[PDB]
A paper describes a structure:
Two crystal structures of the CAP domain of pathogen-related yeast protein from Saccharomyces cerevisiae, Pry1CAP, are presented. Our previous studies revealed that Saccharomyces cerevisiae CAP proteins are required for the export of sterols in vivo and they bind cholesterol in vitro. The sterol binding and export properties of these proteins are localized to the CAP domain, which is sufficient to rescue sterol export properties of cells lacking endogenous Pry proteins. The overall monomer surface area for Pry1CAP is 7125 Å2 and its topology is an alpha-beta-alpha sandwich made up of 6 helices, 2 disulfide bonds, 12 beta turns and 1 beta bulge.
In one Pry1CAP structure, a magnesium ion from the crystallization solution is coordinated by the tetrad which results in a slight shift in the histidines when compared to the structure without the divalent cation. The CAP cavity tetrad residues of Pry1CAP (His208, Glu215, Glu233 and His247) superpose well with the corresponding residues from representative CAP proteins8111329. Electron density for four 1,4-dioxane molecules were observed in the initial molecular replacement 2Fo − Fc maps when dioxane was present in the crystallization solution; this density is absent in the Mg2+ structure, which does not have 1,4-dioxane in the crystallization solution. Furthermore, cholesterol binding by Pry1CAP is inhibited by EDTA and adding magnesium ions restores sterol binding, indicating that magnesium is important for sterol binding by Pry1CAP. The observation that EDTA inhibits cholesterol binding and that addition of Mg2+ restores cholesterol binding by Pry1 is surprising since the cholesterol binding CBM and the CAP tetrad that binds Mg2+ are located at distinct sites in the Pry1CAP monomer. The cholesterol and Mg2+ binding sites are distinct and unconnected in the Pry1CAP monomer. Mg2+ dependent sterol binding by Pry1CAP requires the interaction of both binding sites, likely occuring via dimerization, because Pry1CAP forms dimers in solution, and both crystal structures have a crystallographic dimer in which the CBM and CAP tetrad are connected within a large 7063 Å3 volume cleft.
Residue numbers in the entry: 159 to 299
Amino acid sequence: LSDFASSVLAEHNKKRALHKDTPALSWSDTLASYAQDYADNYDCSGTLTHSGGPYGENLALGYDGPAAVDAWYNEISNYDFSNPGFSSNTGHFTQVVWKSTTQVGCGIKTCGGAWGDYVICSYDPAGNYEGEYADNVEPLA
Ligand SMILES: [Mg+2]
């Protein structure tokens, strides 16, 4: 794996191990080809829009690879494990730790000095299935 791929995969697994019964991810070359193509074509507008593809997806603007994973994960501060499910400010975290997700692949592209890096990670199987959060988003162990 490349330095970007290794550091990003490692950051996912460092976080997932903090949670009960959550296995590590592996890198997928096909997922990364998908994500890097979307990163290649990103319009550097400052707006984050999902690709609408078949995989799970996390997006960030202004962080390198590992720092993006860190920011996604830090949404745990808004997650109420007593009331699991989706919210606009927890969906990145729940995809990072989604138990049934087994593979991740990501891409990156600079958007200049005013935006920093655009980072997209694609996930297979996808996370954030409504009604399945309790089975796939475990509490801190
Ligand atoms: Mg996103």
